[PDB]
Amino acid sequence: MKGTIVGTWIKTLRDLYGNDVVDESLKSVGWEPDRVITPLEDIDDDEVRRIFAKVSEKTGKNVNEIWREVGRQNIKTFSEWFPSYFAGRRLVNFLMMMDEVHLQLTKMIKGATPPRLIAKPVAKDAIEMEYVSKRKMYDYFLGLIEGSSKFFKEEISVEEVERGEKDGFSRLKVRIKFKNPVFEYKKN
Numbered sequence: 600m601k602g603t604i605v606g607t608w609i610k611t612l613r614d615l616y617g618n619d620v621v622d623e624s625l626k627s628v629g630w631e632p633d634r635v636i637t638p639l640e641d642i643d644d645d646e647v648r649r650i651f652a653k654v655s656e657k658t659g660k661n662v663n664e665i666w667r668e669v670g671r672q673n674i675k676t677f678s679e680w681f682p683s684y685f686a687g688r689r690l691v692n693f694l695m696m697m698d699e700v701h702l703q704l705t706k707m708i709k710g711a712t713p714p715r716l717i718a719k720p721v722a723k724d725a726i727e728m729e730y731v732s733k734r735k736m737y738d739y740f741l742g743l744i745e746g747s748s749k750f751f752k753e754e755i756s757v758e759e760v761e762r763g764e765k766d767g768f769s770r771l772k773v774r775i776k777f778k779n780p781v782f783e784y785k786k787n
């Protein structure tokens with residue numbers, strides 16, 4: 600996982616659960632007191648998994664619940680640490696940009712396997728977004744969408760279309776419907 604993104608999770612975990620939980624959890628995987636992660640650094644996925652496992656053990660919360668709350672709260676962290684991706688954008692623009700953003704931010708990681716997040720308009724007031732990744736981080740994905748709606752103050756409904764796993768890739772396709780129309784028909 601891209602290191603500075605793991606950085607946002609650590610910060611979001613402190614917001615949710617406190618510095619003691621997080622400090623103890625980072626201690627258990629040997630992290631310096633207290634490390635600053637560089638933009639080129641990759642952090643091993645299994646190290647992330649062990650950090651979150653320690654948070655689960657100390658808080659008593661299931662790891663999937665933690666990932667969901669982290670996704671919900673990490674949009675705010677992103678707005679602080681990566682503010683250029685926000686900057687007056689509308690929610691639908693933000694969501695439809697995510698696939699390209701994740702390709703850009705992992706371009707110079709070796710064996711980079713960013714999630715794919717392709718969104719396509721399906722109605723004047725709706726997009727379909729399909730998560731595709733070997734990591735199967737459904738709760739984080741769904742939590743980011745919910746946090747995105749709160750942050751942009753645009754009400755959405757999220758309905759699952761389908762999910763699957765083939766050849767190690769997990770897929771989750773959701774239909775995001777906006778209360779207000781966000782698209783118009785134009786001649787192709």
Ligand code: HEM
Pocket residue numbers: 600601604677678681684694697700701704705711712713714716730732733734735736739740743744747
């Ligand atoms: C400014 C906002 C965001 C930035 C800068 C950002 C960037 C990133 C980066 C660089 C990664 C690591 C990928 C890797 O190392 O392979 C990541 C993880 C992830 N991102 Fe985002 N992201 C943002 C918002 C979102 C949103 C809105 C969604 C979904 C709707 C999303 C879905 C995910 C998921 C599910 C992962 C976990 C990795 C996986 O499942 O394979 N992210 N993010």
